[PDB]
Write an enzyme that holds these catalytic residues in place. Structure first.
Site, PDB file in Angstrom:
ATOM      1  N   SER A  43       0.776  -1.243   0.000  1.00  0.00           N
ATOM      2  CA  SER A  43       0.000   0.000   0.000  1.00  0.00           C
ATOM      3  C   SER A  43       0.808   1.294   0.000  1.00  0.00           C
ATOM      4  O   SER A  43       0.222   2.365  -0.085  1.00  0.00           O
ATOM      5  CB  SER A  43      -0.972   0.046   1.164  1.00  0.00           C
ATOM      6  OG  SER A  43      -1.967  -0.919   0.984  1.00  0.00           O
ATOM      7  N   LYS A  59       2.904   6.704   5.321  1.00  0.00           N
ATOM      8  CA  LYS A  59       1.986   5.742   4.732  1.00  0.00           C
ATOM      9  C   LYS A  59       2.538   4.330   4.895  1.00  0.00           C
ATOM     10  O   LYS A  59       3.681   4.064   4.538  1.00  0.00           O
ATOM     11  CB  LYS A  59       1.790   6.028   3.243  1.00  0.00           C
ATOM     12  CG  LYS A  59       0.914   4.985   2.550  1.00  0.00           C
ATOM     13  CD  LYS A  59      -0.563   5.226   2.859  1.00  0.00           C
ATOM     14  CE  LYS A  59      -1.439   4.012   2.503  1.00  0.00           C
ATOM     15  NZ  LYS A  59      -1.423   2.967   3.575  1.00  0.00           N
ATOM     16  N   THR A  60       1.722   3.425   5.428  1.00  0.00           N
ATOM     17  CA  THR A  60       2.133   2.034   5.625  1.00  0.00           C
ATOM     18  C   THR A  60       1.829   1.132   4.424  1.00  0.00           C
ATOM     19  O   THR A  60       1.064   1.490   3.519  1.00  0.00           O
ATOM     20  CB  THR A  60       1.424   1.433   6.843  1.00  0.00           C
ATOM     21  OG1 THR A  60       0.001   1.526   6.646  1.00  0.00           O
ATOM     22  CG2 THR A  60       1.814   2.189   8.104  1.00  0.00           C
ATOM     23  N   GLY A  61       2.440  -0.049   4.431  1.00  0.00           N
ATOM     24  CA  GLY A  61       2.118  -1.099   3.481  1.00  0.00           C
ATOM     25  C   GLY A  61       2.238  -2.422   4.213  1.00  0.00           C
ATOM     26  O   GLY A  61       3.185  -2.618   4.974  1.00  0.00           O
TER      27      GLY A  61
END
Ligand SMILES: CC(C)(O/N=C(\C(=O)NCB(O)O)c1csc(N)n1)C(=O)O
Length: 261
Positions: free
Chosen positions: A49, A206-208
């Site tokens: 993501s 922002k994470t993934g």
């Protein structure tokens, strides 16, 4: 900071990677000096993501000279929903505005929101095209196995893009401000970069997360009386079932924070 503290940091990153059965990809940049702490910086990792940052920037670029785009509502239906859509699932029918979709996908990692924005731009190739336009020749979005180059980037390439987007002038000033505002309000990253840097620093991230213990976090930390520090952390593992390691991501950020202070 100093080169010697950075050499020490990089060995600490290697030692950190030994604590899990996988690869750690890391770049931290002190924008005051251009000092860079890196580990596997030129290897490809699945971005999961974290691509949603590049998405959202591309959308913001379309809105230059057309701020009303952000208020345009995009209809969609239940059959348009994909897995993990905690925000968009509530607004089936009339749908959500472009700004609302950007917020949803950045702050909650809403997947349907991302797909709608990808569609608005004309498809995933438009996101890749946008990355090329801001000097990222590495990023590739192929779709909305370890070793596959599809849907990957390198920590080095993503760090440069994060820097140019959130700190530099890849976007116009107003659009940069909006991208920061959204990422500052992220809800999914409390145990990652935010957990490793001092509590007094503001973090836009922002994470993934994916299978193979893929645990990512990218963003910028804003200390109160010094220049921003860019953080990019990618981790992925050999076992498909393995959980992502929030603690490892936090620890990697902490190693660089200590070196740059
Ligand atoms: C399943 C669905 C909704 O989403 N697939 C995702 C996903 O859930 N991404 C969420 B994220 O990393 O916060 C994904 C990308 S790589 C990986 N492993 N999982 C999709 O793309 O259809």
């Amino acid at each position: 900071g100093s080169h010697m503290r950075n050499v020490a940091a990089e060995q600490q990153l290697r030692e950190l990677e030994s604590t899990f059965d996988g690869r750690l990809g890391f770049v931290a940049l002190d924008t005051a000096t251009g000092a860079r702490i890196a580990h596997r910086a030129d290897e490809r990792f699945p971005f999961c993501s974290t691509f949603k940052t590049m998405l959202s920037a591309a959308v913001l670029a379309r809105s230059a000279g057309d701020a009303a785009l952000l208020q345009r509502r995009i209809p969609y239906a239940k059959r348009d929903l994909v897995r993990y859509s905690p925000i968009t699932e509530k607004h089936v029918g009339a749908g959500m505005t472009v700004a609302e979709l950007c917020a949803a996908t950045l702050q909650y990692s809403d997947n349907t929101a991302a797909n709608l924005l990808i569609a608005l731009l004309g498809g995933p190739q438009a996101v890749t095209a946008y990355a090329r336009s801001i000097g990222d020749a590495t990023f590739r979005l192929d779709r909305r196995l370890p070793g596959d180059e599809r849907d990957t980037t390198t920590p080095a390439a993503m760090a440069a893009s994060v820097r140019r987007l959130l700190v530099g002038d890849a976007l116009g000033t107003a659009q940069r401000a909006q991208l920061n505002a959204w990422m500052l309000g992220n809800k999914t990253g409390d145990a990652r970069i935010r957990a490793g840097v001092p509590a007094g620093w503001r973090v836009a991230d922002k994470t993934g997360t994916g299978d193979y213990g893929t645990g990512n976090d990218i963003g910028v930390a804003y200390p109160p009386d010094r220049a921003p520090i860019v953080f990019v952390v990618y981790t992925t593992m050999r076992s498909r079932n393995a959980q992502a390691r929030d603690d490892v991501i936090a620890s990697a950020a902490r190693i660089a924070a200590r070196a740059f202070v």
